[PDB]
Ligand binder design. Structure first.
Ligand SMILES: OC[C@H]1O[C@H](O[C@H]2[C@H](O)[C@@H](O)[C@@H](O[C@H]3[C@H](O)[C@@H](O)[C@@H](O)O[C@@H]3CO)O[C@@H]2CO)[C@H](O)[C@@H](O)[C@@H]1O
Length: 476
């Protein structure tokens, strides 16, 4: 009797490319590309387990633009320049970026502490600040390759910075290829999401928020977004086909968000399986285990993620010693294994790139220990999404209705409901009446609403500039 374990790492960035200038106004796609988007599937070269990935199409577009050398990334320009060529504003942006990231474990360089405690920085000090900002985001692969430059910790030259930059772009250029490789070799399945990561249930029916939060205030949705909901899914199928040569049959619904209408749309668009959150299951069925494969109306397969296990990795284990965390995770799997006489399917689904910066050494000790341990546990079998979809020796249940929600509290309050978020929806509703191109789809991304107030929102003014620029561009 096995326990089936299914990792599904979700990779996404909203579009940071300002549509009038073409400038990438934040570097987060670059930094997560060099730190996480190649390195997470690259573990499959070293560990004989299965790991699955979601790539949003908008993320794929940006990875391609960086790989082609076309991304005009303003922060990265300030890193690349000789410090004698830095504008005053670029020095300020470099220091502010450092300050925002200063307390993260991946920024724990003695030299960063020295530089941030100095009233003025000279050219050699600025070179160190530029190069250490780059190296703080070094991924697993290059942390071995560049180990000697990493252990320097200071006294970097322009030549060394450019060498690091060159290696980083090498990583980006081979990133889509590694997803094709691990997919073709059967080491993982790759899914995608509706194109710009929108909240499909709200686009289909804004009143679905009242299935969970009767007291929420929403704006007057005086225009239909239902056709846009279909377009996000259709365009995503085509982008996926461009990369992989096939239409996707698995999708990750953004924010785990489902509704009866959203599930019908995914079925109509040929999606065979998705996953969502355990809280949705609890809200929808009186008594139901997340270790079964579910069939929504016999139309589409649904797995409900194990929220506890997923949140332990995504939010808890950065605060743990790595060996202890792996022992805790395996011991929880052992308890699940011993708790049922059938073979449970355990979905661990979470963002694939956001938790690691808070772990010791970027989560590399934790993941290496976790994966090394898993590959040797005879009673655990990790599965691709395809294997999980088709596994016969598993328990199964038909479900007829879900209560609309997300993986954040089972409801939509992170994206709608307060004055500031509602103002964004009002702006979008009015723009949609006048919309002339697909930039309206960009503005439907969940990210813009996530950050709109909110007191914890790094660079929130940039997200606001982007959202409003996409809204304006959509009407021209
Ligand atoms: O400056 C704020 C913030 O920006 C960047 O965060 C991005 C994440 O890295 C990226 O994965 C994505 O995050 C969303 C997840 O995909 C999604 O599943 C859910 O968890 O919501 C997230 C927010 O929408 O997008 C955000 C930006 O929207 C940057 O990496 C952070 O360090 C930085 O704090």
């Amino acid at each position: 009797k096995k326990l089936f374990l299914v990792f599904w790492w979700h990779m996404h960035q909203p579009l940071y490319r300002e549509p009038y200038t073409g400038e990438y106004l934040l570097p987060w796609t670059f930094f997560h590309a060099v730190k996480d988007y190649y390195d997470m599937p690259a573990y499959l070269k070293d560990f004989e387990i299965k790991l699955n990935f979601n790539l949003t199409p908008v993320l794929i577009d940006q990875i391609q633009e960086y790989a082609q050398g076309k991304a005009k990334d303003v922060f990265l320009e300030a890193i690349r320049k000789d410090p004698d060529d830095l504008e005053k504003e670029e020095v300020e942006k470099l220091i502010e970026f450092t300050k925002l990231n200063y307390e993260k474990p991946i920024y724990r360089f003695e030299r960063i502490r020295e530089l941030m405690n100095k009233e003025k920085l000279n050219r050699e000090e600025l070179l160190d600040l530029q190069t250490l900002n780059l190296l703080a985001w070094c991924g697993r692969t290059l942390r071995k390759d560049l180990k000697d430059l990493l252990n320097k910790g200071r006294n970097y030259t322009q030549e060394e910075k450019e060498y690091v930059l060159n290696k980083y772009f090498e990583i980006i250029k081979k990133t889509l290829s590694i997803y094709r490789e691990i997919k073709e070799e059967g080491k993982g399945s790759v899914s995608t999401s509706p194109y710009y990561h929108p909240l499909i249930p709200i686009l289909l029916n804004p009143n679905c928020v009242y299935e969970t939060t009767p007291n929420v205030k929403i704006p007057d949705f005086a225009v239909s977004f239902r056709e846009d909901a279909s377009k996000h899914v259709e365009l995503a199928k085509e982008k996926y086909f461009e990369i992989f040569g096939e239409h996707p049959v698995y999708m990750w619904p953004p924010e785990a968000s489902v509704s009866n209408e959203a599930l019908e749309l995914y079925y109509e668009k040929g999606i065979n399986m998705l996953a969502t959150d355990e809280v949705i299951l609890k809200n929808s069925v009186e008594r139901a285990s997340p270790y079964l494969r579910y069939y929504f109306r016999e139309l589409i397969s649904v797995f409900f993620r194990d929220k506890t296990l997923s949140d332990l990795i995504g939010f808890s284990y950065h605060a743990w010693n790595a060996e202890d965390a792996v022992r805790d995770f395996i011991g929880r799997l052992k308890k699940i294994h011993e708790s049922v006489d059938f073979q449970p399917v355990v979905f661990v689904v979470l963002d694939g790139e956001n938790c690691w910066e808070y772990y010791e050494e970027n989560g590399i000790p934790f993941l290496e220990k976790l994966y090394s341990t898993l590959e040797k546990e005879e009673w655990i079998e990790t599965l691709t999404l395809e294997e999980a979809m088709r596994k016969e020796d598993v328990k199964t249940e038909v479900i007829e209705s879900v209560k609309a929600g997300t993986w954040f509290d089972g409801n939509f309050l992170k994206w709608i409901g307060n004055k500031e978020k509602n103002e964004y929806w009002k702006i979008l509703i009015e723009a949609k009446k006048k919309a002339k191109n697909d930039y309206i789809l960009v503005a439907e991304g969940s990210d813009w609403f996530w950050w709109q107030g909110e007191e914890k929102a790094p660079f929130v003014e940039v997200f606001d500039k982007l959202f409003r620029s996409f809204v304006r561009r959509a009407q021209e």
